[PDB]
Design a protein around this ligand. Structure first.
Ligand SMILES: [Ca+2]
Ligand SMILES: [Ca+2]
Lengths: 158, 157
DNA sequence: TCAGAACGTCGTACGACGTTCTGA
DNA sequence: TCAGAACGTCGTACGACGTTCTGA
């Protein structure tokens, strides 16, 4: 692992630059609560170097690689189980994205209990908090969307 | 020390992603041979995180930081002396860009003798091979232009 | 009902050039 | 004459979303 820690450090550098540690509110039509707080780590690269994404997945021992239809490729670790393990590996070497990683780790604490509306609501608040740290400009689903909906659904939060 | 090389491994990962190890032929009108082969490592980032570039310079202990006029900032290490040292630190850890690093290291061997047009010509040929590895689409000055010019200048390749 | 796998694309933060300033 | 320091900006390779597919 003296060896491994060099890999993780390298990877941390790569994610700090060409990566994206994020947390979204995704609409889920068949969820009782209508929404999920998705958490993810993602690495982007031109498909012409698709292989490096496969090397990251080997390093982490989880996650998926895909080519998108525009010449780009992506590596993605989605969801509490895989992500938490991944982020603890990178956390000591992350510099730019340590805020998002720590925040996402708080979200992951909550995900087992997001069938409870107040918990789902907590997580979504945290999710918006991550979105302020990123360079996103297309984010439309906010915590206030969740709060309006939860209320309309008959639940009680604040 | 292992703490240093965790820094360099991180830096390598950062350069691999948001960096640029490069070689260009720059026009220099007061040069006898009219051209320089410039070598450089550069790290880009939005000025809103200007500070990270200052950390990289602290880690490398050389190079310069600048704010560009479009919200971007850059950390640059230019030229053989400081560059060779930098690239040797990162080389064990670079993955995407190890080819440019090695190629540029070949160029750096030649730079102390680029008053010799035959040597300038070799360097310029190498600088072209680095450019084929980058995603550049704006490259104008090729080795062919150095050769055309040297010959016009009365030199022999 | 869940929720990852797999996906499609908008907007710019990068990359990667070429050029002028400065001074050895 | 050199050659880094400092520069200005074009074109896209990224980021960072939101949506459909699949199956537990
Ligand atoms: Ca970046
Ligand atoms: Ca990149």
């Amino acid at each position: 692992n003296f060896h491994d820690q060099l890999k993780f450090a390298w990877l941390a550098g790569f994610v700090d630059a060409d990566g994206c540690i994020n947390a979204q509110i995704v609409s889920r039509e068949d969820y009782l609560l209508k929404y999920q707080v998705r958490v993810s780590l993602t690495v982007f690269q031109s498909t012409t170097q698709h292989f490096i994404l496969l090397d990251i997945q080997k390093i982490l021992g989880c996650g998926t690689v895909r080519k998108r239809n525009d010449g780009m490729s992506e590596f993605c670790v989605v969801g509490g189980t895989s992500l938490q393990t991944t982020l603890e590996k990178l956390l000591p070497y992350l510099n730019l994205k340590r805020a998002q990683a720590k925040l996402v780790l708080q979200i992951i604490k909550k995900l087992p209990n997001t069938k409870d509306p107040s918990v789902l609501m907590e997580a979504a608040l945290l999710a918006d908090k991550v979105g302020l740290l990123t360079d996103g400009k297309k984010r439309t689903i906010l915590a206030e969307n969740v709060r309006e909906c939860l209320k309309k659904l008959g639940h009680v939060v604040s």
